[PDB]
Design an enzyme around this catalytic site. Structure first.
Site, PDB file in Angstrom:
ATOM      1  N   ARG A   1      48.026   7.535   0.352  1.00  0.00           N
ATOM      2  CA  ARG A   1      46.292   7.286   0.228  1.00  0.00           C
ATOM      3  C   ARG A   1      46.011   7.732  -1.125  1.00  0.00           C
ATOM      4  O   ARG A   1      44.790   7.357  -1.121  1.00  0.00           O
ATOM      5  CB  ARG A   1      46.099   8.457   1.508  1.00  0.00           C
ATOM      6  CG  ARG A   1      46.373   8.126   2.798  1.00  0.00           C
ATOM      7  CD  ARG A   1      45.944   9.036   3.819  1.00  0.00           C
ATOM      8  NE  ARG A   1      45.838   8.695   5.163  1.00  0.00           N
ATOM      9  CZ  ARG A   1      46.536   8.903   6.255  1.00  0.00           C
ATOM     10  NH1 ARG A   1      47.670  10.034   5.956  1.00  0.00           N
ATOM     11  NH2 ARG A   1      46.542   8.421   7.455  1.00  0.00           N
TER      12      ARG A   1
ATOM     13  N   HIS B   1      58.745   8.757  -0.963  1.00  0.00           N
ATOM     14  CA  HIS B   1      59.731   8.195   0.011  1.00  0.00           C
ATOM     15  C   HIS B   1      61.015   7.840  -0.541  1.00  0.00           C
ATOM     16  O   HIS B   1      62.128   8.013  -0.028  1.00  0.00           O
ATOM     17  CB  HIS B   1      59.170   6.705   0.624  1.00  0.00           C
ATOM     18  CG  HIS B   1      57.796   7.006   1.150  1.00  0.00           C
ATOM     19  ND1 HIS B   1      56.690   6.352   0.586  1.00  0.00           N
ATOM     20  CD2 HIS B   1      57.278   7.815   2.306  1.00  0.00           C
ATOM     21  CE1 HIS B   1      55.502   6.870   1.520  1.00  0.00           C
ATOM     22  NE2 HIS B   1      55.890   7.528   2.341  1.00  0.00           N
TER      23      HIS B   1
ATOM     24  N   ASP C   1      54.222  17.375   4.075  1.00  0.00           N
ATOM     25  CA  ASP C   1      53.644  17.578   5.739  1.00  0.00           C
ATOM     26  C   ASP C   1      54.586  18.706   6.263  1.00  0.00           C
ATOM     27  O   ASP C   1      55.313  18.403   7.357  1.00  0.00           O
ATOM     28  CB  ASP C   1      53.690  16.119   6.483  1.00  0.00           C
ATOM     29  CG  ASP C   1      53.128  14.953   5.698  1.00  0.00           C
ATOM     30  OD1 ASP C   1      53.672  14.356   4.959  1.00  0.00           O
ATOM     31  OD2 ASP C   1      51.801  15.139   5.917  1.00  0.00           O
TER      32      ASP C   1
ATOM     33  N   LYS D   1      52.446  13.029  -4.372  1.00  0.00           N
ATOM     34  CA  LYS D   1      52.635  11.617  -3.870  1.00  0.00           C
ATOM     35  C   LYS D   1      52.074  11.333  -2.650  1.00  0.00           C
ATOM     36  O   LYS D   1      52.349  12.140  -1.654  1.00  0.00           O
ATOM     37  CB  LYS D   1      53.974  11.108  -4.180  1.00  0.00           C
ATOM     38  CG  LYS D   1      54.479  11.249  -5.636  1.00  0.00           C
ATOM     39  CD  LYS D   1      54.281  10.143  -6.511  1.00  0.00           C
ATOM     40  CE  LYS D   1      55.136   9.949  -7.658  1.00  0.00           C
ATOM     41  NZ  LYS D   1      54.787   8.568  -8.230  1.00  0.00           N
ATOM     42  N   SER D   2      51.207  10.296  -2.249  1.00  0.00           N
ATOM     43  CA  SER D   2      50.966   9.956  -1.063  1.00  0.00           C
ATOM     44  C   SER D   2      50.394   8.556  -1.133  1.00  0.00           C
ATOM     45  O   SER D   2      49.946   8.115  -2.215  1.00  0.00           O
ATOM     46  CB  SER D   2      49.556  10.802  -0.719  1.00  0.00           C
ATOM     47  OG  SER D   2      48.934  10.194   0.437  1.00  0.00           O
TER      48      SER D   2
END
Ligand SMILES: Nc1ncnc2c1ncn2[C@@H]1O[C@H](COP(=O)(O)CP(=O)(O)OP(=O)(O)O)[C@@H](O)[C@H]1O
Ligand SMILES: Nc1ncnc2c1ncn2[C@@H]1O[C@H](COP(=O)(O)CP(=O)(O)OP(=O)(O)O)[C@@H](O)[C@H]1O
EC number: 6.3.2.1
Lengths: 281, 281
Positions: free
Chosen positions: A187, A37, A150, A184-185
């Protein structure tokens, strides 16, 4: 760095921005922010006069037995993270402000959501386009930043912008990874110590698929089998998808030609992770 | 003299410049063949806003599948008519520029489209909201003007603005009528000499409905029946609907409470006419 928690004030700020010729970059997120992000935020701060990050855990994109309640929330830490990188506004509306009762008009994705994650997560992309459409009408950005992790979402959002004539330009950013390659996530925090070590093999399996392609393989079945077998011998997670589809058209390939993406979905104990690589001209 | 703008790109350019300059925009969407009803809305916009844009776009998505190129085309006359009222721009995009491919995202109206004309032509209002959403994203108006002649449409468009968070304020303009009460419409010319005299009883039947209501009638059935019987004995055309629903919720109830509207649809020889009245508190 300003926390804006109503649609009305966000609108007021935007209208004032337009009047002064202040360019706006926008990064829509569900919070629990990480360097993926922040990479988008960094590019936006370089390009645009003001940068707005939304943090809104969108109930419409969570299905049954997914992780809406468990989804990490940490708005103060999120605000700090994006402040450090030069963001101007965190837009964090209440669910009830975004969704005041039932929607009278429904927005639904067509064929792009009948395959892959749209088949795996029924209604998920309908939820995504619903909230992104609203956020674009609220923030009225010049540029909106999305992650190629995504990839299917990115293609769908780009189609929505075209279909709805949103003036916004979509920028897709390359997948941001941990040093060991793990995408990277937010979750990733759900992963146990051992799963975290296994999860690195998702990215490694894509480098395997790339080498197979590099060395001249064009039968999707062979790539999928070799990737699948590799994952099976290295991870405890359930391999939900290993697929080869044209990109951005999202049509299944058997014998590979053109631009494709090879995509993975893996369900660990709690963490459901995805990854992909886009290859070809 | 109003400028005819025939591309989305040039329309977008003009709007972008206006937002920087603090120029307010009023917008009147139409399908052309303009008359005094349209011009009242244009006049209203010219009084309130810095610039006034009138679209002329025959939207294929809100016509049935068998419908040809009957809907009148007369861009020069429409442009002359809105110039005389002080409109700045006529936006007249090609169907191919508005709809270049298959739409990848679909917009569908919920229960507001399940009654009245929406019930007869499922998909009509899907087509309306589709084009209106696009035009709002193109023109980015501060105010958009719609006639109360199409009361269901107005309610649906207002709901869409709320659902999608369009910054636009929707202004409903009263039905403009001939001296004898006939709602203005392109179709009126198609009435025969005796039919034109009969057609005045649409408006008179609504005045009857209001009178019955004011005298204390609250059962929707009785208003429907009394209006229907009055109409049938004064016209040679065929009644397509006489209906009573809450407004703007469009829900029916045996016993009238709150604000309602009574709507009519009548088929004469060559003309299909509609009218309505909104009454009650
Ligand atoms: N590793 C990564 N690299 C680049 N962009 C990423 C990324 N991970 C997430 N993003 C992007 O950041 C935006 C916000 O996504 P969110 O769902 O809010 C956080 P996430 O948990 O990282 O994604 P996920 O929930 O799909 O795993 C999306 O456009 C997404 O594609
Ligand atoms: N008599 C009238 N009074 C007020 N508004 C009217 C009106 N007649 C049409 N309008 C408005 O003009 C706008 C555009 O109408 P169009 O889409 O061009 C079809 P139409 O004009 O309703 O056909 P018509 O010729 O039968 O009126 C709509 O918002 C409609 O409600």
């Amino acid at each position: 760095t300003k926390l804006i928690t109503t649609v009305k004030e966000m609108q007021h700020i935007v209208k004032a921005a337009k009047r002064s010729g202040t360019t706006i970059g926008f990064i829509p997120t569900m919070g629990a922010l990480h360097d993926g992000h922040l990479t988008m935020v960094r590019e936006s701060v370089s390009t645009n006069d003001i940068t707005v990050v939304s943090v809104f855990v969108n109930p419409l994109q969570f299905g049954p037995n997914e992780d809406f309640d468990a989804y990490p929330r940490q708005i103060d830490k999120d605000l700090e993270l994006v402040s450090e990188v030069g963001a101007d506004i965190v837009f964090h509306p209440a669910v009830e402000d975004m969704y005041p009762g039932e929607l009278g008009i429904d927005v639904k994705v067509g064929p792009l959501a009948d395959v892959l994650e749209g088949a795996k997560r029924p209604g998920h992309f309908d939820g995504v386009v619903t909230v992104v459409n609203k956020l674009f009408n609220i923030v009225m950005p010049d540029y909106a930043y999305f992650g190629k992790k995504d990839a299917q979402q990115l293609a769908i959002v780009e189609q929505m912008v075209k279909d709805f004539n949103h003036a916004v330009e979509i920028i897709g950013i390359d997948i941001v990874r941990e040093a060991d390659g793990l995408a990277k996530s937010s979750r990733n925090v759900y992963l146990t110590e051992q799963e975290r070590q296994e999860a690195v093999h998702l990215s490694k399996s894509l480098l395997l698929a790339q080498a197979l392609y590099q060395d001249g393989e064009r039968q999707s079945k062979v790539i999928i089998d070799k990737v699948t077998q590799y994952l099976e011998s290295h991870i405890s997670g359930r391999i939900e998808e290993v697929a080869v589809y044209s990109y951005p058209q999202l049509v299944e390939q058997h014998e590979i030609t053109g631009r494709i993406f090879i995509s993975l979905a893996v369900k660990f104990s709690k963490a459901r992770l995805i990854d992909n690589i886009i290859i070809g001209a």
